[PDB]
């Protein structure tokens, strides 16, 4: 499923991401934009044998199990396929663990390079939240 900007902000707010670990909703919407372009089916293999999945591009090395990644930890205890549904519950739940690991949203490279330090609220402004 390809979310609409405001559609996703509403879903994320509903799932309690607004100010989670101190990060305003805009951060989460902005991260999704540059990680997956709002596409929950988003799939990308890395040269190291790991893969990133879903709206927030969670990695298969430590966080989800995809059955083909060496050194798998599966800390989110969910199969990577569950991160592909049009229901973002799994991605949100896993992201909450990731963003609580001790480095904030610095776990997301796209957020670091495109969102961090910018006017992130712009990504939810207008929408009826």
């Amino acid at each position: 499923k390809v979310f609409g900007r405001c559609e996703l902000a509403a879903a994320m707010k509903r799932h309690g991401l607004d100010n989670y670990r101190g990060y305003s909703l805009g951060n989460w919407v902005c991260a999704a934009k540059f990680e997956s372009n709002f596409n929950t089916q988003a799939t990308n293999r890395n040269t190291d044998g790991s893969t990133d999945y879903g709206i927030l591009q969670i990695n298969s090395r430590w966080w989800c199990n995809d059955g083909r990644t060496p050194g798998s930890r599966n800390l989110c205890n969910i199969p990577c396929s569950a991160l592909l549904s049009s229901d973002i519950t799994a991605s949100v739940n896993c992201a909450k663990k990731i963003v609580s690991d001790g480095n904030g949203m610095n776990a997301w490279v796209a957020w670091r390079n495109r969102c961090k330090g910018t006017d992130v609220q712009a990504w939810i402004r207008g929408c009826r939240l």
Partner: protein
Amino acid sequence: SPKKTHWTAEITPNLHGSEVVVAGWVAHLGDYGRVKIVKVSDREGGAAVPVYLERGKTPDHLFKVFAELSREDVVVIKGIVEATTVTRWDTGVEIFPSEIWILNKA
């Protein structure tokens, strides 16, 4: 092994752009895929400086060294300091390494 030039508490935003060599133990490890973060300390009850490995920016061979890393390992790290805003999750400084030496496994 290069020679220590700063203590982790001595790594401050002022050093932005300059090369430093830190030496201590692995306080924390984070593997998030395209980004890996290793925190290094050399003094109990002191600062842990975040060392950053980012695909497309960090030399690929360092990602192998990181894979052999464990908490409490003693390391020596040469890298460039980059300044950041202090937050709940940001020390105000980051090190982008060019070398990562493992002196001792826990």
